[PDB]
Design a protein around this ligand. Structure first.
Ligand SMILES: OC[C@H]1O[C@@H](O[C@H]2[C@H](O)[C@@H](O)[C@H](O[C@H]3[C@H](O)[C@@H](O)[C@H](O)O[C@@H]3CO)O[C@@H]2CO)[C@H](O)[C@@H](O)[C@@H]1O
Ligand SMILES: OC[C@H]1O[C@@H](O[C@H]2[C@H](O)[C@@H](O)[C@@H](O)O[C@@H]2CO)[C@H](O)[C@@H](O)[C@@H]1O
Ligand SMILES: [Ca+2]
Length: 454
């Protein structure tokens, strides 16, 4: 331990967060004793077992686009920083979560060109405030097919399975092989269709804003790393020409973040490492420069206390994700020497901000004055379909990164504030990776064998 925070405790808790999001019949490896079996009929309206995976946020919809982006990012964390997971004793836990979610994606892929991308209706789910185990509303399941396609979600799910096939190969080679075959098939489904016309049930929640060419690249990169089949690298590289642009221009948009919707930055970073080509270094460096010292004279907004601030809804998610990219690229022998130190220090600053450098932790159950009322139905555990009853959450959602402060560093801690005070799979995803790197650098010991037991 040589840093400002206990990064192993933070990593351990940030992984544990996913336990609390689990849907379906809980396996005996779950550490906590307060979540129970839930959503056991998922898929039965379509004749299939679609139980499992993760509830998305503070709700009980299963939205496979952010769920699969999460899947990919957790495996990317292991891919980069396995030795940190081994040292902290956290490898088994993050692999359990990766296996869990990719098992659910396999369930969601019951015919080559049939993929279930949602379980739950946003309207019905959101209208009730109570814990998962007692839900009584209908929970329809929704699918895309060749005639009603969803290339964005299908490709992102392909990425997740390909990445899992890599990092789970040592522990479970059989399952890793299964995941790779489903990844290949899903990738073909997304390429043959190149359309999101049938991806409708997530509208209002997780629309595909940027389109699917960023996911086509990203999934092909993971598939290349899983297979060593150079066709996938050809595709990955090719689809760069159709990546999201600054509107009205031919210039790839570097002013957002790697996130559930838009994975081109991570794809660029990995293509830079794989190929060494200046084209990809130019993409990822424009982005990381914009977030740090500036690019072509403009720089992301910063709060006074040092948060790089993209948007008021899940500001910490975007900054912590960019932190992980900054660490991965700065670890690369190809990164320019001086940018190494700029990028690393930027990543440290954003993770430290999350953990409490500004005076307050933004991670549930960790640090100084952490959030106590996250917008989360199951942690709260109302018996009265009411955010105000009980006044205090029944359960502590250890490790959950909340949305984050305003652009002036302020924050409140209100159950009703889903903009600043919700928690989500995608919010924790890059954060886990960035925490592994900080533990690698600075240590801080996890709480031995910590379990969230009431
Ligand atoms: O044009 C700016 C960038 O937009 C990116 O998409 C964002 C959407 O514009 C945005 O409405 C949406 O917001 C979500 C949020 O991400 C989620 O956590 C939450 O629960 O609900 C919000 C409101 O529905 O986010 C997406 C992704 O950031 C593009 O991805 C990007 O290419 C573009 O530059
Ligand atoms: O979609 C934004 C958030 O919605 C939250 O649900 C709201 C719902 O939108 C309203 O119609 C009303 O019913 O109040 C709900 C809160 O009790 C939902 O809980 C969050 O997960 C969403 O991000
Ligand atoms: Ca996209």
């Amino acid at each position: 331990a040589s840093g400002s925070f206990n990064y192993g405790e933070a990593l351990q808790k940030a992984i544990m967060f996913y336990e609390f999001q689990m849907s379906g019949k809980l396996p005996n490896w779950v550490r906590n004793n307060w979540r129970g079996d839930s959503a056991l009929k998922d898929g039965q309206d379509n004749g299939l077992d679609l139980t499992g995976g993760w509830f998305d946020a503070g709700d009980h919809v299963k939205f496979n686009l952010p769920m699969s982006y999460t899947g990919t990012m957790l495996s990317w964390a292991v891919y980069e920083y396995k030795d940190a997971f081994v040292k902290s004793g956290q490898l088994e836990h993050i692999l359990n979560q990766i296996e869990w979610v990719n098992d659910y994606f396999v369930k969601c892929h019951p015919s080559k060109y049939v993929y279930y991308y949602q379980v739950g209706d946003g309207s019905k789910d959101h209208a009730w405030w109570g814990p998962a185990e007692v839900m009584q509303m209908e929970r329809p399941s929704f699918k895309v097919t060749q005639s009603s396609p969803g290339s964005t979600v299908v490709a992102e799910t392909a990425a997740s399975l390909a990445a899992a096939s890599i990092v789970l190969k040592d522990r479970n080679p059989t399952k890793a092989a299964t995941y790779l075959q489903h990844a290949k098939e899903l990738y073909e489904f997304a390429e043959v269709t190149k359309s999101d016309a049938g991806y409708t049930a997530a509208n209002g929640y997780y629309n595909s804003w940027s389109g699917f060419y960023d996911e086509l690249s990203w999934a092909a990169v993971w598939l290349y790393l899983a297979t060593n089949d150079s066709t996938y690298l050809t595709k990955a590289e090719s689809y760069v020409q159709n990546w999201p642009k600054i509107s009205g221009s031919n210039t790839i948009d570097y002013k957002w973040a790697h996130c559930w919707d838009d994975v081109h930055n991570g794809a660029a970073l990995l293509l830079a490492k794989i190929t060494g080509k200046d084209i990809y270094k130019q993409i990822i460096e424009s982005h990381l420069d914009y977030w740090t010292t500036g690019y072509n004279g403009e720089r992301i907004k910063y709060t006074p206390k040092g948060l790089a601030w993209l948007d008021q809804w899940g500001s910490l998610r975007y900054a912590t994700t960019t932190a992980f990219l900054a660490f991965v690229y700065s670890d690369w022998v190809g990164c320019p020497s001086t940018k190494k130190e700029i990028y690393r220090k930027f990543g440290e600053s954003q993770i430290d901000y999350a953990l409490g450098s500004a005076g307050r932790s933004f991670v549930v159950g960790f640090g100084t004055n952490p959030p106590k009322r996250p917008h989360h139905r199951t942690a709260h555990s109302s018996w009265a379909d009411s955010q105000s009853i009980p006044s205090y959450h029944r359960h502590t959602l250890y490790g959950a990164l909340v949305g984050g402060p305003g652009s002036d560093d302020s924050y409140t801690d209100d159950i009703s504030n889903y903009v600043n005070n919700e928690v989500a799979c995608d919010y924790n995803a890059g954060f886990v990776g960035a925490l592994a790197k900080m533990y690698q650098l600075y240590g801080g010991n996890p709480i031995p064998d910590f379990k969230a037991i009431e």
